Amino acid sequence: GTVASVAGTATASGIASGTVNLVGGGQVKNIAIAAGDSAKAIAEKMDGAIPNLSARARTVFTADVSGVTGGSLNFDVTVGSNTVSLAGVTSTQDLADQLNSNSSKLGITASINDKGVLTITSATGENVKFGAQTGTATAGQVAVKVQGSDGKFEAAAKNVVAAGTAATTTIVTGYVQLNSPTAYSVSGTGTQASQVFGN
The DSSP annotation for 78-139 comes to EETTEEEEEEEE-SHHHHHHHHHHTHHHHT-EEEE-TTS-EEEEETT---EEE----SS-SE
Q: How far is CA 6 from the centre of its chain?
A: 8
For residue 46, the 8-state DSSP code is: H
Cβ burial of 175 (10 Å; 0-12, 13-18, 19+) is buried
> Are the C-beta atoms of residues 39 and 7 closer than 8 Å to each other?
yes
Technique used: X-ray
> Are the C-beta atoms of residues 50 and 171 closer than 8 Å to each other?
no
Torsion on CA atoms 84, 88, 89, 94, rounded to nearest 10: -80
Distances (CA, A) of 144 to 9, 88, 103, 129, 149: 8, 19, 18, 12, 16
Domain residue ranges of the chain, discontinuous segments joined by +: 9-57+176-197, 59-173
